[PDB]
Amino acid sequence: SASEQRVTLTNADKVLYPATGTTKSDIFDYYAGVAEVMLGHIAGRPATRKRWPNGVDQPAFFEKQLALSAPPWLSRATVAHRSGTTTYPIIDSATGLAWIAQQAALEVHVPQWRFVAEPGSGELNPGPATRLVFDLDPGEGVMMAQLAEVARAVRDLLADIGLVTFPVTSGSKGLHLYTPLDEPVSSRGATVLAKRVAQRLEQAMPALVTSTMTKSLRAGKVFVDWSQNSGSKTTIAPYSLRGRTHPTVAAPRTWAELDDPALRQLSYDEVLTRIARDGDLLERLD
Template sequence: MTPITEVEGRRLALSNLEKVLYPATGFTKGELLHYYATTAGVLLPHLRDRPVSFLRYPDGPDGQVFFTKNVPPGTPEWVTTAEVPRVEGPARMVFVQDLASLMWAANLVTEFHTPQWVIGAPGEADRLVFDLDPGAPATVVECCDVALWLRERLAADGIEAYAKTSGSKGLHLAAAIRPVSSERATEYAKELAVEAEKALPRLAVHRMTKSLRPGKVFVDWSQNAARKTTAAPYTLRARREPAVSAPVTWEEVADCRSPGALTVLAPDLAPRLQDFGDLLAPLLDVGGAGVLP
């Protein structure tokens, strides 16, 4: 029998709580739901007012994994949805605005992905992102070297960057910016990616071409495009272990010397929040946003 629980006055059916979703550690769906419930305080502000795309893995990472942007069938009427402009035409998408919506979405077993804009100003980027993706034999260690260079380069333009793990092999950089068109944000990010390749020719590459990437870090600037999304802060990822896309300090980035040094698993996050709070909280401060040159 599927247990029914009440969250903020909403009745939710939470299913298959004993199902193992992460085979490497035995982490269950019940533990996944507990993780999201206890992380909601820092996760929800980063989701609020941004249309959420879902990468679903209901049977774990070894089962079927599929990406959806449209409102899933069976979505409760109390979950916020809205028409969102897209290149291929408008679509109705989900907005995770509160704990009840978060737990409903988590019960679908999903990664949370968001664009760099809010629904009040679609296509107007208020965040700048770089996805640093290592090509073997490069690892997150090389990503950290590139991230430190990008941090200094952004600072030269008056933009403060923050780092988080991708929850996979790489690293994400994010910065709050005064809203500009997504086209301008993408253009600026590409300019810096090209500069990174010139400054670090043995480490960085700004093109996605597979043959260029072994041993280097692909500085993916394209996720600033209006139609693109990035894994949200604190989302779990569909990996063998319950890895989190977790904020890290610049000291941790500078000290990174091994491929697993920055891995953050779900059980690790609560103590990190006690020690550091939300390291990405400055992204929510519009007044502290940088201005693109």
């Protein structure tokens, strides 16, 4: 079969997280374990990689274009940006995630739009936003209860327009909130909508929330970042590992989980246990 997808893991024993001894083999098994739940949320999207060839204590790089050296069987599609054109991989199979692991691409980042097959030729072109994302970034001195209250407030504003919101702890510091769209809208449109939500929240709790980056207004506030809805921006994918000291994950959570004052980021091993018990908390997102 000319279309047969195969990935060979090399250097299985290579440690990619020196703090914890987490190896390429660990990562390979992790992305295998999460494939079923992860794929639905990255399907149809251009996948930006961040790679750490010798692990998180060695230099890393983002990669967007799909190199010719990559497997020919990977799906791919082209985006025409201001300074040229970029052809990205679309990860849409378990073996694709095996390639991500083999690449030491600890991080997978995707935008909030999907490629759509053009009526005539079937050629893939960027289509509408399918969901909104908000990145809630806690400023200096902001506690969990404040960040949670701000998340619940975003959720409540969205609920007023009959939208449902899903939280995902970023694995870093952020809390991301995703909301699937009832009706399709351009990324430009999605960004205007998300901005309106953020500014409305800022009006409602200006002591606790900001909708702008302005850095002297950041302390003591949650920055409700609406800017990642831009079509040219990309956001860490749910279930992606993070290239951080520990192998934490962009982990879906329940709303009740956010009410825990001891809320913390989850490790890859915990995410696997959670999937086995509860399945995908983001089932309804995509």
